Design an enzyme around this catalytic site. Structure first.
Site, PDB file in Angstrom:
ATOM      1  N   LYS A   1     -19.980  26.060   3.990  1.00 20.91           N
ATOM      2  CA  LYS A   1     -21.189  25.776   3.219  1.00 20.91           C
ATOM      3  C   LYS A   1     -22.393  26.447   3.879  1.00 20.91           C
ATOM      4  O   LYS A   1     -22.684  26.194   5.053  1.00 20.91           O
ATOM      5  CB  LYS A   1     -21.386  24.268   3.133  1.00 20.91           C
ATOM      6  CG  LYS A   1     -22.091  23.779   1.919  1.00 20.91           C
ATOM      7  CD  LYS A   1     -22.852  22.530   2.295  1.00 20.91           C
ATOM      8  CE  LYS A   1     -23.798  22.086   1.211  1.00 20.91           C
ATOM      9  NZ  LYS A   1     -24.046  20.624   1.307  1.00 20.91           N
TER      10      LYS A   1
ATOM     11  N   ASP B   1     -24.390  10.631  -4.921  1.00 11.96           N
ATOM     12  CA  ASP B   1     -24.163  11.793  -5.778  1.00 11.96           C
ATOM     13  C   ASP B   1     -22.710  11.817  -6.232  1.00 11.96           C
ATOM     14  O   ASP B   1     -22.078  12.875  -6.313  1.00 11.96           O
ATOM     15  CB  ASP B   1     -24.546  13.086  -5.060  1.00 11.96           C
ATOM     16  CG  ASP B   1     -24.820  14.231  -6.016  1.00 11.96           C
ATOM     17  OD1 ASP B   1     -25.327  13.980  -7.136  1.00 11.96           O
ATOM     18  OD2 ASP B   1     -24.566  15.389  -5.612  1.00 11.96           O
TER      19      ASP B   1
ATOM     20  N   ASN C   1     -27.984  25.520  -6.587  1.00 18.54           N
ATOM     21  CA  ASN C   1     -29.401  25.855  -6.484  1.00 18.54           C
ATOM     22  C   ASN C   1     -29.817  26.174  -5.049  1.00 18.54           C
ATOM     23  O   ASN C   1     -30.671  27.043  -4.827  1.00 18.54           O
ATOM     24  CB  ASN C   1     -30.241  24.702  -7.038  1.00 18.54           C
ATOM     25  N   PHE C   2     -29.217  25.502  -4.059  1.00 18.93           N
ATOM     26  CA  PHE C   2     -29.638  25.667  -2.670  1.00 18.93           C
ATOM     27  C   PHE C   2     -28.501  25.819  -1.670  1.00 18.93           C
ATOM     28  O   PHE C   2     -28.775  25.956  -0.475  1.00 18.93           O
ATOM     29  CB  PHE C   2     -30.498  24.475  -2.250  1.00 18.93           C
ATOM     30  CG  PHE C   2     -29.906  23.158  -2.650  1.00 18.93           C
ATOM     31  CD1 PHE C   2     -28.660  22.766  -2.162  1.00 18.93           C
ATOM     32  CD2 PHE C   2     -30.581  22.325  -3.537  1.00 18.93           C
ATOM     33  CE1 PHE C   2     -28.102  21.565  -2.531  1.00 18.93           C
ATOM     34  CE2 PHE C   2     -30.031  21.118  -3.911  1.00 18.93           C
ATOM     35  CZ  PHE C   2     -28.781  20.736  -3.406  1.00 18.93           C
TER      36      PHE C   2
ATOM     37  N   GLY D   1     -17.937  28.134  -4.560  1.00 24.04           N
ATOM     38  CA  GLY D   1     -18.903  27.154  -5.002  1.00 24.04           C
ATOM     39  C   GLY D   1     -20.304  27.700  -4.834  1.00 24.04           C
ATOM     40  O   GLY D   1     -20.606  28.441  -3.894  1.00 24.04           O
TER      41      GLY D   1
ATOM     42  N   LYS E   1     -24.289  27.507  -1.119  1.00 24.72           N
ATOM     43  CA  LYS E   1     -23.177  28.244  -1.673  1.00 24.72           C
ATOM     44  C   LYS E   1     -22.055  28.117  -0.661  1.00 24.72           C
ATOM     45  O   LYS E   1     -22.305  28.072   0.547  1.00 24.72           O
ATOM     46  CB  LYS E   1     -23.574  29.697  -1.956  1.00 24.72           C
ATOM     47  CG  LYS E   1     -22.904  30.762  -1.130  1.00 24.72           C
ATOM     48  CD  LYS E   1     -23.291  32.141  -1.675  1.00 24.72           C
ATOM     49  CE  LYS E   1     -22.804  32.312  -3.112  1.00 24.72           C
ATOM     50  NZ  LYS E   1     -22.838  33.730  -3.629  1.00 24.72           N
ATOM     51  N   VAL E   2     -20.824  28.032  -1.155  1.00 22.39           N
ATOM     52  CA  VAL E   2     -19.653  27.773  -0.324  1.00 22.39           C
ATOM     53  C   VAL E   2     -18.713  28.964  -0.428  1.00 22.39           C
ATOM     54  O   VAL E   2     -18.407  29.432  -1.531  1.00 22.39           O
ATOM     55  CB  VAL E   2     -18.921  26.478  -0.729  1.00 22.39           C
ATOM     56  CG1 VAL E   2     -17.816  26.167   0.284  1.00 22.39           C
ATOM     57  CG2 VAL E   2     -19.890  25.303  -0.843  1.00 22.39           C
TER      58      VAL E   2
END
Length: 425
Positions: A37, A130, A18-19, A15, A21-22
């Site tokens: 994460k 979200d 923008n800010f 994953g 990543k996994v």
């Protein structure tokens, strides 16, 4: 050198954004698989750093079988790491990429888990804000696993929120107007957008720009397809209500006809949290033999700060990896569009040629896996994804698995569909 962080060996990226990543990882003491994460602490402003404190605080208190669970928090000066449950089955929109619009009986199976999770949150006075497709993941058994509480927050009867953080297509109309909202009603709107999209294949509101998307959203009229049941259309008249006061609460939603057809005995009821089991003696005695002192263990589980020691104990109550004594044999949503008898290496020669013709760039990572990229970051169309050839439960049949790494689900579905239509296998 970053192969490890804490007690975890990091693997591929699963994953990206923008800010954050996994990456997938394996705990080095207990063998379990996790998702890590990776949040970069240097690019946060006052507002994003208040969201990140709210995110770790809220994940510390949710315990539901369809919500991603936190395992450990590891900090450095410039980076924060949230170790969490790995959902290995993809995202719920994979059914729409593979098969198009879903059958209401199958959409209902996932939507019962989604509403159960989301209402469990609203019972602990938590709003997600979200609830978009990218955040409805699936585990290995294709159970819903709601993720990324980064935009989440707590609400209190008597107080109101004002932030607008989620995706525009899933956003209740109060948000589009800058209007102070009560909370849980903006998820109930957003779940109506999800259910409309799963049973119809596309979003209820869309315009070729945000002003048109805003205008369509505020009028609140969506297309009723010929194949849609009265029951489903009466439920969306409870989710997509323009006035937030008139929208149902998820407690009422649970007792809606459509959500319980096929479940007449077991009606959907609010999930009741289990009791905290922080005294499992079998797991404690396993830890002492791995080199942990009983007092350090007991203190760590009383302090509940998701450190090394608490993490090993939680991970011990997860299914261990299987004992050890060329495409992979995997269970994924295969399709006859991409299933074939052809030798897998010629399947990849065919996959690689079709990618070239649709101007997709790729990099080979394993024998049967490519990392693919397509689009231009100006047009909100850049998307990255995996393609892997995996076996099916028969003798010489193989398929092509698509998994989005990065990008909008909408753009993933377009590019993944077009590749699948043009594979000649």
């Amino acid at each position: 050198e970053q192969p490890h962080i804490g007690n975890y060996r990091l693997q591929k990226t699963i994953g990206k954004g923008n800010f954050a990543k996994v990456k997938l990882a394996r705990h080095v003491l207990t063998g379990r698989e996790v998702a890590v994460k990776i949040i970069d602490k240097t690019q946060l402003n006052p507002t994003s750093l208040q969201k990140l404190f709210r995110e770790v605080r809220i994940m510390k208190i949710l315990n539901h079988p369809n919500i991603v669970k936190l395992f450990e928090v590891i900090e450095t000066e410039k980076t924060l790491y949230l170790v969490m449950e790995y959902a290995s089955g993809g995202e719920v929109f994979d059914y729409l990429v593979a098969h198009g619009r879903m059958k209401e009986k199958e959409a209902r199976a996932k939507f019962r888990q989604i509403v159960s999770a989301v209402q469990y949150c609203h019972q602990k006075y938590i709003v997600h804000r979200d609830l978009k497709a990218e955040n409805l993941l699936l585990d290995g058994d294709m159970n819903i696993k709601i993720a990324d509480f980064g935009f989440s927050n707590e609400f209190t009867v008597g107080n109101k929120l004002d932030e607008f953080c989620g995706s525009p297509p899933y956003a209740a109309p109060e948000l589009f107007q800058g209007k102070k909202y009560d909370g849980p009603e903006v998820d109930v709107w957003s779940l109506g957008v999800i259910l409309y999209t799963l049973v119809s294949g596309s979003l209820p509101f869309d315009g070729q720009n945000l002003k048109e998307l805003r205008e369509r959203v505020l009028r609140g009229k969506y297309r009723i397809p010929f194949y849609m049941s009265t029951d489903c259309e009466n439920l969306l008249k409870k989710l997509l209500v323009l006035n937030p006061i008139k929208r149902g609460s998820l407690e009422q939603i649970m007792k809606d006809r459509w959500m319980n057809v096929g479940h007449e005995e077991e009606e959907l009821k609010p999930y009741t949290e289990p009791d905290p089991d922080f005294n499992d003696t079998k797991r404690i005695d396993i830890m002492v033999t791995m080199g942990f002192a009983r007092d350090e263990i007991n203190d760590a589980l009383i302090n509940q700060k998701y450190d090394e020691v608490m993490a090993t104990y939680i991970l011990l109550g997860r299914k261990p990896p299987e004992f050890e004594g060329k495409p992979r044999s995997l269970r994924f949503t295969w399709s006859m569009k991409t299933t074939s008898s052809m030798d897998p290496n010629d399947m990849m020669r065919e996959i690689r040629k079709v990618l070239d013709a649709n101007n997709c760039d790729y990099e080979q990572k394993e024998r049967f896996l490519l990392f693919c990229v397509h689009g231009d970051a100006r047009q909100d169309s850049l998307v990255q994804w995996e393609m892997e050839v995996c076996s099916l439960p028969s003798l010489s049949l193989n398929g092509v698995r698509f998994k989005r790494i990065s990008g909008t689900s909408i753009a993933f579905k377009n590019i993944a569909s077009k590749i699948a239509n043009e594979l000649k296998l």
